[PDB]
Design an enzyme around this catalytic site. Structure first.
Site, PDB file in Angstrom:
ATOM      1  N   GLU A  35       0.779  -1.412   0.301  1.00 45.30           N
ATOM      2  CA  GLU A  35       0.291   0.215   0.374  1.00 45.30           C
ATOM      3  C   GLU A  35       1.329   1.509   0.198  1.00 45.30           C
ATOM      4  OE1 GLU A  35      -2.898   0.376  -0.133  1.00 45.30           O
ATOM      5  OE2 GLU A  35      -3.965  -1.235  -0.158  1.00 45.30           O
ATOM      6  N   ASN A  46      -7.857   9.287  -5.595  1.00 43.49           N
ATOM      7  CA  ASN A  46      -8.459   8.691  -6.371  1.00 43.49           C
ATOM      8  C   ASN A  46      -9.483   9.270  -7.612  1.00 43.49           C
ATOM      9  OD1 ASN A  46      -7.366   5.967  -5.351  1.00 43.49           O
ATOM     10  ND2 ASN A  46      -9.055   6.774  -3.538  1.00 43.49           N
ATOM     11  N   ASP A  49     -13.268   8.633  -8.044  1.00 43.19           N
ATOM     12  CA  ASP A  49     -14.703   8.578  -6.714  1.00 43.19           C
ATOM     13  C   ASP A  49     -14.107  10.154  -6.363  1.00 43.19           C
ATOM     14  OD1 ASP A  49     -12.631   7.740  -5.423  1.00 43.19           O
ATOM     15  OD2 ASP A  49     -13.664   5.748  -4.371  1.00 43.19           O
ATOM     16  N   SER A  51     -12.051  10.375  -3.640  1.00 43.39           N
ATOM     17  CA  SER A  51     -11.430  10.265  -2.788  1.00 43.39           C
ATOM     18  C   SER A  51      -9.998   9.993  -2.844  1.00 43.39           C
ATOM     19  CB  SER A  51     -12.170   8.601  -2.277  1.00 43.39           C
ATOM     20  OG  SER A  51     -11.371   8.021  -2.805  1.00 43.39           O
ATOM     21  N   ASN A  60      -9.031   5.230   3.382  1.00 45.76           N
ATOM     22  CA  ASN A  60      -9.641   5.973   2.193  1.00 45.76           C
ATOM     23  C   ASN A  60     -10.283   7.236   3.325  1.00 45.76           C
ATOM     24  OD1 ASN A  60     -12.672   6.013   0.574  1.00 45.76           O
ATOM     25  ND2 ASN A  60     -10.838   5.807  -0.430  1.00 45.76           N
TER      26      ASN A  60
END
Length: 130
Positions: A35, A46, A49, A51, A60
């Site tokens: 990650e 992102n 979307d 986020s 998130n």
């Protein structure tokens, strides 16, 4: 801060991550590695979307932390996303514990499915003394 492998392993152990909700330390290590590369200031926007994923565990903003700019967001972990960019990972760990308390568990992170699930993950904690 960018953690060294074994340094992170012992830290997560001390923070009670080993075996949390059935999740082995090696799996938490495999997750952080893919990650963020054990990097606490990593952030991923992102565009799809609107986020953002924050910190070592790429948490998130739509469901776990609040950054104010994410559409239709909620704060399940009840933390400012800012807290997940600190060198002290206590908060990121507490948020990660909250994420896996949901039925999906460690599977909430697709990356875990792609590179950790059903694999030999001992390599992540070998020789760390944790």
């Amino acid at each position: 801060k960018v953690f060294e492998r074994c340094e992170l392993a012992r830290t997560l152990k001390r923070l009670g991550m080993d075996g949390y909700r059935g999740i082995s330390l090696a799996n938490w290590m495999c997750l952080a590695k893919w990650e963020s590369g054990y990097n606490t200031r990593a952030t991923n926007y992102n565009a799809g979307d609107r986020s953002t994923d924050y910190g070592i565990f790429q948490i998130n903003s739509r469901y776990w932390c609040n950054d104010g700019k994410t559409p239709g967001a909620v704060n399940a972990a009840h933390l400012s996303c800012s807290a997940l960019l600190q060198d002290n990972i206590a908060d990121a760990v507490a948020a990660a514990k909250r994420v896996v308390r949901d039925p999906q568990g460690i599977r909430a992170w697709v990356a875990w499915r792609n590179r950790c699930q059903n694999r030999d993950v001992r390599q992540y904690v070998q020789g760390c003394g944790a």
